[PDB]
């Protein structure tokens, strides 16, 4: 009866997800604070040009973005938080490629995002379809549900 841990695995876009990470890691127990990144030139910062790319990873037109990480045994984490950016409608499929590695583990796995308040229902459907697998205890944005997810 000692088998519980808490990890955070996030993707910092360009200066949003960051404030949110270092917040939450200090409102939880003695957890850890980890970062993902993707391939370079997977996207741009546009409205139109980028939505084509993120749709190229949905319809089945293209493959999915690689990650630049090292391999971790997630099996010893009872809780895993995830932080992700929000493009104009849907994410950049960041968590997609990681989930394909971690699909067989258990724990509680909340996957929140940073946004300009927007597409707050689209992101949830898009996460669901691209994450039917691990046990999610909730899907919200920013820190405004942290206090339930790490109890």
UniProtKB/TrEMBL annotation:
Record Pfam families: Flavodoxin_4
UniProt cross-references to PROSITE patterns, sorted A to Z: FLAVODOXIN (PS00201), FLAVODOXIN_LIKE (PS50902)
This protein's UniProt keywords: Flavoprotein, FMN, Nucleotide-binding
Example of a GO MF term: FMN binding
Residues engaged in binding FMN: 12-14, 16-17, 86, 88, 114, 116-119
InterPro entries in the record: Flavodoxin/NO_synth, Flavodoxin_CS, Flavoprotein-like_sf
Stretches assigned to coiled coil: none
Domain of life: Bacteria
Domain named Flavodoxin-like: residues: 6-151
Keyword Cytoplasm: no
PANTHER family to which the protein is assigned, alphabetical: EXPORTED PROTEIN-RELATED (PTHR39201), FLAVODOXIN-LIKE DOMAIN-CONTAINING PROTEIN (PTHR39201:SF1)
Protein name per Swiss-Prot or TrEMBL: Putative trp repressor binding protein
Naturally occurring in which organism (per UniProt): Lactobacillus acidophilus (strain ATCC 700396 / NCK56 / N2 / NCFM)
Lineage: Bacteria, Bacillati, Bacillota, Bacilli, Lactobacillales
């Amino acid at each position: 009866g000692m088998a519980k841990k808490t990890l955070i695995l996030y993707y910092s876009w360009s200066g949003e997800t960051k404030k949110m990470a270092e917040k939450i890691n200090s409102e939880i127990k003695d957890s850890e604070l980890k970062e993902v990144k993707v391939s370079e030139g997977t996207f741009d910062a546009d409205m139109y040009k980028t939505s084509d790319i993120a749709l190229d990873q949905i319809q089945g037109n293209k493959d999915f973005p690689e990650i630049q990480l090292d391999n971790i045994d997630y099996n010893n984490y009872d809780l895993i938080l995830i932080g992700s950016p929000v493009w104009s409608g849907y994410p950049a499929t960041p968590i997609k490629t990681l989930l394909d590695q971690m699909k067989n583990y258990r724990g509680e796995v909340a996957s929140f995002f940073t946004s300009a308040g927007t597409n707050h229902k689209a992101y949830v459907s898009h996460f669901n379809e691209w994450a039917d697998g691990l046990n999610v205890i909730g899907v919200a944005r920013d820190d405004s549900e942290v206090d339930k997810w790490s109890k």
